Amino acid sequence: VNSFSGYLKLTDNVYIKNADIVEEAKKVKPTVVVNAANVYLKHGGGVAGALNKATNNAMQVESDDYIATNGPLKVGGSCVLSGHNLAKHCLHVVGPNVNKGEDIQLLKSAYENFNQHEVLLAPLLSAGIFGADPIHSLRVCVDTVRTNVYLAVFDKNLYDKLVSSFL
Ligand SMILES: OCC1(Nc2ncnc3[nH]ccc23)CC1
Ligand SMILES: [Cl-]
């Protein structure tokens, strides 16, 4: 039993809700919130800009030190950093950016990072400003993630279409 509330069960391990991931994080304080990161951990907009703003820019400050030490992430890769006031940990995951021509096949690799954590609050990777088909992102999630994932989907109209086309 966990404290996630109001989610629709899609499969044995995947759940979904029409909500801002930032608000779900503020309410649940999950062990792991997933950020839809880019390789530079520049948290400007979308999920990343919203999470970072909610941390009063502490996420960005921590991220800049991470990059200065370690260099950029790989597309499809991830790192674990602090969750600040939103969660215990933030798993920064880089899905491919279709607008930059990055290989959508890397979306599966991106979701594989979720399997290192038993329970996660996550957005749809590569959706929104990242330019991929969100229906496809949900399919890859369900077919790749084996741990328990709670998907917060900000856009109401998007949430409605994701549910209806699933089974
Ligand atoms: O609409 C779904 C998507 N975006 C978001 N999802 C969850 N929480 C969010 N907070 C800000 C943006 C945002 C993935 C594209
Ligand atoms: Cl977005």
PDB file of C-alpha atoms and ligand atoms in Angstrom:
ATOM      1  CA  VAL A   1       0.000   0.000   0.000  1.00  0.00           C
ATOM      2  CA  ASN A   2       1.197   3.503  -0.919  1.00  0.00           C
ATOM      3  CA  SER A   3      -0.244   7.019  -0.687  1.00  0.00           C
ATOM      4  CA  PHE A   4      -0.882   7.660  -4.397  1.00  0.00           C
ATOM      5  CA  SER A   5      -4.555   8.612  -4.792  1.00  0.00           C
ATOM      6  CA  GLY A   6      -7.012   8.862  -7.667  1.00  0.00           C
ATOM      7  CA  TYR A   7      -4.958   6.967 -10.251  1.00  0.00           C
ATOM      8  CA  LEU A   8      -6.431   4.740 -12.940  1.00  0.00           C
ATOM      9  CA  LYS A   9      -4.767   1.313 -13.055  1.00  0.00           C
ATOM     10  CA  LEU A  10      -3.571   0.504 -16.583  1.00  0.00           C
ATOM     11  CA  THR A  11      -1.601  -2.703 -15.948  1.00  0.00           C
ATOM     12  CA  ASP A  12      -0.186  -4.742 -13.084  1.00  0.00           C
ATOM     13  CA  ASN A  13       2.417  -2.020 -12.442  1.00  0.00           C
ATOM     14  CA  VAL A  14       1.436   1.173 -14.334  1.00  0.00           C
ATOM     15  CA  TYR A  15      -1.025   3.792 -13.039  1.00  0.00           C
ATOM     16  CA  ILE A  16      -2.073   7.196 -14.432  1.00  0.00           C
ATOM     17  CA  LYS A  17      -3.658  10.457 -13.239  1.00  0.00           C
ATOM     18  CA  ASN A  18      -4.470  13.863 -14.766  1.00  0.00           C
ATOM     19  CA  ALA A  19      -2.240  16.016 -12.554  1.00  0.00           C
ATOM     20  CA  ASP A  20       0.808  18.261 -12.506  1.00  0.00           C
ATOM     21  CA  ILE A  21       3.749  16.110 -11.399  1.00  0.00           C
ATOM     22  CA  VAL A  22       4.847  19.047  -9.223  1.00  0.00           C
ATOM     23  CA  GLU A  23       1.557  18.965  -7.300  1.00  0.00           C
ATOM     24  CA  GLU A  24       1.625  15.165  -6.983  1.00  0.00           C
ATOM     25  CA  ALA A  25       5.160  15.494  -5.622  1.00  0.00           C
ATOM     26  CA  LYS A  26       4.201  18.223  -3.142  1.00  0.00           C
ATOM     27  CA  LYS A  27       1.335  16.052  -1.859  1.00  0.00           C
ATOM     28  CA  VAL A  28       2.875  12.563  -1.834  1.00  0.00           C
ATOM     29  CA  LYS A  29       6.568  13.319  -1.184  1.00  0.00           C
ATOM     30  CA  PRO A  30       7.475  10.115  -3.055  1.00  0.00           C
ATOM     31  CA  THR A  31      10.767   8.323  -2.669  1.00  0.00           C
ATOM     32  CA  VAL A  32      11.518   9.074  -6.341  1.00  0.00           C
ATOM     33  CA  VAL A  33      10.185  11.764  -8.676  1.00  0.00           C
ATOM     34  CA  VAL A  34      11.338  11.509 -12.291  1.00  0.00           C
ATOM     35  CA  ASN A  35      12.434  14.653 -14.117  1.00  0.00           C
ATOM     36  CA  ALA A  36      12.154  14.857 -17.906  1.00  0.00           C
ATOM     37  CA  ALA A  37      15.737  16.070 -18.199  1.00  0.00           C
ATOM     38  CA  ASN A  38      18.014  17.083 -21.050  1.00  0.00           C
ATOM     39  CA  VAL A  39      21.670  16.063 -21.318  1.00  0.00           C
ATOM     40  CA  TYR A  40      22.871  19.378 -19.827  1.00  0.00           C
ATOM     41  CA  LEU A  41      20.434  19.304 -16.885  1.00  0.00           C
ATOM     42  CA  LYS A  42      19.233  22.767 -17.946  1.00  0.00           C
ATOM     43  CA  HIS A  43      15.782  22.796 -16.359  1.00  0.00           C
ATOM     44  CA  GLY A  44      14.142  25.535 -18.383  1.00  0.00           C
ATOM     45  CA  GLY A  45      10.595  24.473 -19.220  1.00  0.00           C
ATOM     46  CA  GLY A  46       8.054  21.689 -19.231  1.00  0.00           C
ATOM     47  CA  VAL A  47       8.400  19.177 -16.420  1.00  0.00           C
ATOM     48  CA  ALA A  48      11.986  20.218 -15.696  1.00  0.00           C
ATOM     49  CA  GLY A  49      11.361  23.947 -15.544  1.00  0.00           C
ATOM     50  CA  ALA A  50       8.316  23.334 -13.342  1.00  0.00           C
ATOM     51  CA  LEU A  51      10.096  20.998 -10.912  1.00  0.00           C
ATOM     52  CA  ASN A  52      13.073  23.323 -10.685  1.00  0.00           C
ATOM     53  CA  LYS A  53      10.888  26.382 -10.030  1.00  0.00           C
ATOM     54  CA  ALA A  54       9.160  24.492  -7.202  1.00  0.00           C
ATOM     55  CA  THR A  55      12.602  23.928  -5.592  1.00  0.00           C
ATOM     56  CA  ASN A  56      13.374  27.671  -5.711  1.00  0.00           C
ATOM     57  CA  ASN A  57      16.199  26.887  -8.219  1.00  0.00           C
ATOM     58  CA  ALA A  58      17.982  24.509  -5.789  1.00  0.00           C
ATOM     59  CA  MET A  59      17.599  21.711  -8.346  1.00  0.00           C
ATOM     60  CA  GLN A  60      19.437  23.817 -10.940  1.00  0.00           C
ATOM     61  CA  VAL A  61      22.247  24.745  -8.529  1.00  0.00           C
ATOM     62  CA  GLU A  62      22.781  21.080  -7.631  1.00  0.00           C
ATOM     63  CA  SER A  63      22.584  20.091 -11.300  1.00  0.00           C
ATOM     64  CA  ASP A  64      25.206  22.641 -12.358  1.00  0.00           C
ATOM     65  CA  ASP A  65      27.650  21.157  -9.847  1.00  0.00           C
ATOM     66  CA  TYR A  66      26.814  17.648 -11.124  1.00  0.00           C
ATOM     67  CA  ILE A  67      27.606  18.638 -14.722  1.00  0.00           C
ATOM     68  CA  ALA A  68      30.776  20.506 -13.747  1.00  0.00           C
ATOM     69  CA  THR A  69      32.041  17.300 -12.102  1.00  0.00           C
ATOM     70  CA  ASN A  70      30.698  14.597 -14.426  1.00  0.00           C
ATOM     71  CA  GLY A  71      29.898  16.151 -17.794  1.00  0.00           C
ATOM     72  CA  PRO A  72      26.637  15.715 -19.688  1.00  0.00           C
ATOM     73  CA  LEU A  73      24.366  12.717 -19.468  1.00  0.00           C
ATOM     74  CA  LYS A  74      23.706  10.448 -22.438  1.00  0.00           C
ATOM     75  CA  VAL A  75      20.405  10.540 -24.292  1.00  0.00           C
ATOM     76  CA  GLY A  76      18.634   7.540 -22.775  1.00  0.00           C
ATOM     77  CA  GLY A  77      20.621   7.917 -19.547  1.00  0.00           C
ATOM     78  CA  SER A  78      19.927   9.171 -16.053  1.00  0.00           C
ATOM     79  CA  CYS A  79      21.357  10.281 -12.745  1.00  0.00           C
ATOM     80  CA  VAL A  80      20.010  10.299  -9.191  1.00  0.00           C
ATOM     81  CA  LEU A  81      20.115  13.656  -7.396  1.00  0.00           C
ATOM     82  CA  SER A  82      18.257  15.174  -4.469  1.00  0.00           C
ATOM     83  CA  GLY A  83      14.491  15.504  -4.535  1.00  0.00           C
ATOM     84  CA  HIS A  84      14.780  18.728  -2.507  1.00  0.00           C
ATOM     85  CA  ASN A  85      11.379  19.686  -1.048  1.00  0.00           C
ATOM     86  CA  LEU A  86       9.474  17.499  -3.543  1.00  0.00           C
ATOM     87  CA  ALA A  87      10.714  13.928  -2.970  1.00  0.00           C
ATOM     88  CA  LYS A  88      13.562  12.039  -1.360  1.00  0.00           C
ATOM     89  CA  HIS A  89      15.336  11.644  -4.714  1.00  0.00           C
ATOM     90  CA  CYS A  90      14.956  12.989  -8.227  1.00  0.00           C
ATOM     91  CA  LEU A  91      15.783  10.585 -11.058  1.00  0.00           C
ATOM     92  CA  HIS A  92      16.770  12.848 -13.960  1.00  0.00           C
ATOM     93  CA  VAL A  93      16.042  10.827 -17.123  1.00  0.00           C
ATOM     94  CA  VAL A  94      16.881  11.998 -20.649  1.00  0.00           C
ATOM     95  CA  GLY A  95      14.392  10.852 -23.247  1.00  0.00           C
ATOM     96  CA  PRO A  96      15.170  11.542 -26.901  1.00  0.00           C
ATOM     97  CA  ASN A  97      14.183  14.964 -28.195  1.00  0.00           C
ATOM     98  CA  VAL A  98      12.457  14.313 -31.518  1.00  0.00           C
ATOM     99  CA  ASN A  99      12.741  17.980 -32.511  1.00  0.00           C
ATOM    100  CA  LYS A 100      16.532  17.536 -32.406  1.00  0.00           C
ATOM    101  CA  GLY A 101      16.279  14.395 -34.547  1.00  0.00           C
ATOM    102  CA  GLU A 102      17.284  12.102 -31.684  1.00  0.00           C
ATOM    103  CA  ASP A 103      16.509   8.410 -32.144  1.00  0.00           C
ATOM    104  CA  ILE A 104      13.070   7.560 -30.747  1.00  0.00           C
ATOM    105  CA  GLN A 105      14.382   4.038 -30.161  1.00  0.00           C
ATOM    106  CA  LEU A 106      16.295   5.641 -27.293  1.00  0.00           C
ATOM    107  CA  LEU A 107      12.959   6.091 -25.512  1.00  0.00           C
ATOM    108  CA  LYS A 108      13.030   2.447 -24.423  1.00  0.00           C
ATOM    109  CA  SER A 109      16.537   2.895 -23.005  1.00  0.00           C
ATOM    110  CA  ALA A 110      15.304   5.974 -21.128  1.00  0.00           C
ATOM    111  CA  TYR A 111      12.427   4.070 -19.517  1.00  0.00           C
ATOM    112  CA  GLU A 112      14.773   1.210 -18.513  1.00  0.00           C
ATOM    113  CA  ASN A 113      16.237   3.567 -15.895  1.00  0.00           C
ATOM    114  CA  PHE A 114      12.926   3.341 -14.018  1.00  0.00           C
ATOM    115  CA  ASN A 115      13.547  -0.364 -13.301  1.00  0.00           C
ATOM    116  CA  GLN A 116      16.270   0.555 -10.799  1.00  0.00           C
ATOM    117  CA  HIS A 117      13.595   1.966  -8.443  1.00  0.00           C
ATOM    118  CA  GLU A 118      10.737   0.040  -6.861  1.00  0.00           C
ATOM    119  CA  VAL A 119       8.195   2.911  -7.012  1.00  0.00           C
ATOM    120  CA  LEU A 120       8.295   6.190  -8.950  1.00  0.00           C
ATOM    121  CA  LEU A 121       6.184   9.248  -9.668  1.00  0.00           C
ATOM    122  CA  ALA A 122       6.978  10.030 -13.300  1.00  0.00           C
ATOM    123  CA  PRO A 123       5.947  12.071 -16.343  1.00  0.00           C
ATOM    124  CA  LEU A 124       5.619  10.711 -19.860  1.00  0.00           C
ATOM    125  CA  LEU A 125       9.168  10.827 -21.212  1.00  0.00           C
ATOM    126  CA  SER A 126       9.753  12.573 -24.553  1.00  0.00           C
ATOM    127  CA  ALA A 127       6.170  13.930 -24.590  1.00  0.00           C
ATOM    128  CA  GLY A 128       5.224  17.593 -24.538  1.00  0.00           C
ATOM    129  CA  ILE A 129       8.019  19.952 -25.542  1.00  0.00           C
ATOM    130  CA  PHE A 130      10.289  16.967 -26.312  1.00  0.00           C
ATOM    131  CA  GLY A 131       8.294  16.314 -29.485  1.00  0.00           C
ATOM    132  CA  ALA A 132       7.447  12.595 -29.413  1.00  0.00           C
ATOM    133  CA  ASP A 133       4.016  10.967 -29.689  1.00  0.00           C
ATOM    134  CA  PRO A 134       2.670  10.696 -26.110  1.00  0.00           C
ATOM    135  CA  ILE A 135       0.520   7.676 -26.989  1.00  0.00           C
ATOM    136  CA  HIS A 136       3.723   5.953 -28.091  1.00  0.00           C
ATOM    137  CA  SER A 137       5.515   7.062 -24.923  1.00  0.00           C
ATOM    138  CA  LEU A 138       2.827   5.428 -22.779  1.00  0.00           C
ATOM    139  CA  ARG A 139       3.093   2.210 -24.810  1.00  0.00           C
ATOM    140  CA  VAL A 140       6.876   2.096 -24.390  1.00  0.00           C
ATOM    141  CA  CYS A 141       6.471   2.773 -20.666  1.00  0.00           C
ATOM    142  CA  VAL A 142       4.026  -0.106 -20.194  1.00  0.00           C
ATOM    143  CA  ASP A 143       6.191  -2.461 -22.272  1.00  0.00           C
ATOM    144  CA  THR A 144       9.494  -1.508 -20.577  1.00  0.00           C
ATOM    145  CA  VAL A 145       8.949  -0.535 -16.941  1.00  0.00           C
ATOM    146  CA  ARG A 146       8.441  -3.466 -14.570  1.00  0.00           C
ATOM    147  CA  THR A 147       8.542  -1.524 -11.293  1.00  0.00           C
ATOM    148  CA  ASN A 148       5.563   0.449  -9.972  1.00  0.00           C
ATOM    149  CA  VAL A 149       5.131   3.704 -11.892  1.00  0.00           C
ATOM    150  CA  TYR A 150       2.576   6.441 -11.192  1.00  0.00           C
ATOM    151  CA  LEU A 151       2.263   8.680 -14.251  1.00  0.00           C
ATOM    152  CA  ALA A 152       1.134  12.268 -13.664  1.00  0.00           C
ATOM    153  CA  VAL A 153      -0.133  13.773 -16.942  1.00  0.00           C
ATOM    154  CA  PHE A 154      -0.548  17.553 -16.759  1.00  0.00           C
ATOM    155  CA  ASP A 155      -2.639  18.194 -19.875  1.00  0.00           C
ATOM    156  CA  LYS A 156      -6.287  17.274 -19.306  1.00  0.00           C
ATOM    157  CA  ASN A 157      -7.093  16.803 -22.985  1.00  0.00           C
ATOM    158  CA  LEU A 158      -4.022  14.588 -23.360  1.00  0.00           C
ATOM    159  CA  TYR A 159      -4.959  12.479 -20.329  1.00  0.00           C
ATOM    160  CA  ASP A 160      -8.414  11.862 -21.789  1.00  0.00           C
ATOM    161  CA  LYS A 161      -7.006  10.592 -25.092  1.00  0.00           C
ATOM    162  CA  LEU A 162      -4.355   8.394 -23.443  1.00  0.00           C
ATOM    163  CA  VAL A 163      -6.996   6.505 -21.464  1.00  0.00           C
ATOM    164  CA  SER A 164      -9.452   5.907 -24.301  1.00  0.00           C
ATOM    165  CA  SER A 165      -6.939   4.386 -26.756  1.00  0.00           C
ATOM    166  CA  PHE A 166      -5.194   2.010 -24.343  1.00  0.00           C
ATOM    167  CA  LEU A 167      -6.780  -1.459 -24.285  1.00  0.00           C
TER     168      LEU A 167
HETATM  169  O1  LIG B   1       1.117  16.851 -20.317  1.00  0.00           O
HETATM  170  C1  LIG B   1       1.965  15.748 -20.087  1.00  0.00           C
HETATM  171  C2  LIG B   1       3.440  16.263 -20.092  1.00  0.00           C
HETATM  172  N1  LIG B   1       3.837  17.336 -19.232  1.00  0.00           N
HETATM  173  C3  LIG B   1       3.746  17.396 -17.874  1.00  0.00           C
HETATM  174  N2  LIG B   1       3.347  16.237 -17.251  1.00  0.00           N
HETATM  175  C4  LIG B   1       3.236  16.272 -15.894  1.00  0.00           C
HETATM  176  N3  LIG B   1       3.464  17.290 -15.055  1.00  0.00           N
HETATM  177  C5  LIG B   1       3.873  18.416 -15.732  1.00  0.00           C
HETATM  178  N4  LIG B   1       4.174  19.601 -15.054  1.00  0.00           N
HETATM  179  C6  LIG B   1       4.554  20.529 -16.046  1.00  0.00           C
HETATM  180  C7  LIG B   1       4.473  19.903 -17.279  1.00  0.00           C
HETATM  181  C8  LIG B   1       4.037  18.549 -17.119  1.00  0.00           C
HETATM  182  C9  LIG B   1       4.508  15.213 -20.383  1.00  0.00           C
HETATM  183  C10 LIG B   1       4.132  16.169 -21.470  1.00  0.00           C
HETATM  184 CL    CL B   2       6.257  19.601 -21.643  1.00  0.00          CL
END
